[PDB]
Amino acid sequence: PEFAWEKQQRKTFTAWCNSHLRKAGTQIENIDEDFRDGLKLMLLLEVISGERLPKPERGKMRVHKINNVNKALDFIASKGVKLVSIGAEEIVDGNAKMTLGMIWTIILRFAIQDISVEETSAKEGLLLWCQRKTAPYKNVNVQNFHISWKDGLAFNALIHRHRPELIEYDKLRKDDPVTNLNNAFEVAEKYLDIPKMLDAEDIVNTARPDEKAIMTYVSSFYHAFS
């Protein structure tokens, strides 16, 4: 039995991994299984760092997989990440909850941390960028990475600020949140080559939708527009 934030993070983090793994000629399907041998995890880190990790071992025994995951974890540690709750054995053994936490760590370090706006970095910097870009939209008030995005208007406003032809902003009503959210999600996919990472119903019906999932997707817009 699972949580809503858990279904949110699995969809989102899988789609995010795939938005990078596609540049290296592969995809994952099931985040609970497809990183257990460490190969696609090294691949992911090569794509998002623009660097190369130590040669992977493809011998199919457990010890090689543990070795591959430890290289990945060493590469993350080398970029300044203090890994705490996670270890290579439990990843290879398919600790799905731990594997989700490791992917968040990678998203935070490689997609969010280096964002810097007006002497403000990482999550806070990304939020300030959203605030700046959505300033002139009177029916938008970005104050967080959760409820502020629930009605779909902020997503649409972000796109429209950069690419006004993609969004007919005046059609969008505040009390029509699922239409707004899907509209943004569809435009981002078709036109900005940002794959869908969120589910509209999960966003609307959760008092506070998952801010890691929203941060992940929004970080993709920051990089698409930079």
PDB file of all heavy atoms in Angstrom, residues 116-121 128:
ATOM      1  N   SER A 116      21.274  29.664 -10.186  1.00  0.00           N
ATOM      2  CA  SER A 116      21.639  30.835  -9.354  1.00  0.00           C
ATOM      3  C   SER A 116      20.953  32.046  -9.985  1.00  0.00           C
ATOM      4  O   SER A 116      21.222  32.262 -11.164  1.00  0.00           O
ATOM      5  CB  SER A 116      23.110  31.017  -9.179  1.00  0.00           C
ATOM      6  OG  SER A 116      23.370  32.074  -8.253  1.00  0.00           O
ATOM      7  N   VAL A 117      20.114  32.753  -9.226  1.00  0.00           N
ATOM      8  CA  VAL A 117      19.336  33.971  -9.645  1.00  0.00           C
ATOM      9  C   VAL A 117      19.444  35.019  -8.523  1.00  0.00           C
ATOM     10  O   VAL A 117      19.051  34.731  -7.400  1.00  0.00           O
ATOM     11  CB  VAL A 117      17.870  33.621  -9.916  1.00  0.00           C
ATOM     12  CG1 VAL A 117      17.173  34.801 -10.517  1.00  0.00           C
ATOM     13  CG2 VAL A 117      17.756  32.377 -10.794  1.00  0.00           C
ATOM     14  N   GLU A 118      19.984  36.210  -8.797  1.00  0.00           N
ATOM     15  CA  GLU A 118      20.006  37.305  -7.811  1.00  0.00           C
ATOM     16  C   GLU A 118      20.515  36.773  -6.466  1.00  0.00           C
ATOM     17  O   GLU A 118      19.929  37.049  -5.464  1.00  0.00           O
ATOM     18  CB  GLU A 118      18.574  37.842  -7.700  1.00  0.00           C
ATOM     19  CG  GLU A 118      18.062  38.544  -8.974  1.00  0.00           C
ATOM     20  CD  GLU A 118      16.619  39.037  -8.841  1.00  0.00           C
ATOM     21  OE1 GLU A 118      16.448  39.871  -7.964  1.00  0.00           O
ATOM     22  OE2 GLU A 118      15.699  38.694  -9.604  1.00  0.00           O
ATOM     23  N   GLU A 119      21.702  36.145  -6.474  1.00  0.00           N
ATOM     24  CA  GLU A 119      22.462  35.745  -5.272  1.00  0.00           C
ATOM     25  C   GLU A 119      21.679  34.692  -4.495  1.00  0.00           C
ATOM     26  O   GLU A 119      21.990  34.528  -3.316  1.00  0.00           O
ATOM     27  CB  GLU A 119      22.686  36.902  -4.311  1.00  0.00           C
ATOM     28  CG  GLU A 119      23.359  38.091  -4.925  1.00  0.00           C
ATOM     29  CD  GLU A 119      23.367  39.406  -4.104  1.00  0.00           C
ATOM     30  OE1 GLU A 119      22.339  39.776  -3.400  1.00  0.00           O
ATOM     31  OE2 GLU A 119      24.359  40.144  -4.288  1.00  0.00           O
ATOM     32  N   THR A 120      20.777  33.993  -5.156  1.00  0.00           N
ATOM     33  CA  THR A 120      19.904  32.963  -4.561  1.00  0.00           C
ATOM     34  C   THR A 120      20.110  31.692  -5.398  1.00  0.00           C
ATOM     35  O   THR A 120      19.939  31.743  -6.633  1.00  0.00           O
ATOM     36  CB  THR A 120      18.458  33.433  -4.530  1.00  0.00           C
ATOM     37  OG1 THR A 120      18.517  34.764  -3.969  1.00  0.00           O
ATOM     38  CG2 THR A 120      17.523  32.578  -3.717  1.00  0.00           C
ATOM     39  N   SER A 121      20.404  30.599  -4.728  1.00  0.00           N
ATOM     40  CA  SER A 121      20.727  29.334  -5.452  1.00  0.00           C
ATOM     41  C   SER A 121      19.706  28.225  -5.197  1.00  0.00           C
ATOM     42  O   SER A 121      18.947  28.277  -4.272  1.00  0.00           O
ATOM     43  CB  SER A 121      22.079  28.869  -5.105  1.00  0.00           C
ATOM     44  OG  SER A 121      22.134  28.351  -3.786  1.00  0.00           O
ATOM     45  N   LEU A 128      12.575  31.823  -7.214  1.00  0.00           N
ATOM     46  CA  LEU A 128      12.664  33.273  -7.547  1.00  0.00           C
ATOM     47  C   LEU A 128      12.554  33.421  -9.063  1.00  0.00           C
ATOM     48  O   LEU A 128      11.857  34.304  -9.536  1.00  0.00           O
ATOM     49  CB  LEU A 128      13.969  33.856  -7.015  1.00  0.00           C
ATOM     50  CG  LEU A 128      14.152  35.297  -7.440  1.00  0.00           C
ATOM     51  CD1 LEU A 128      13.040  36.152  -6.907  1.00  0.00           C
ATOM     52  CD2 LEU A 128      15.524  35.782  -6.982  1.00  0.00           C
TER      53      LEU A 128
END
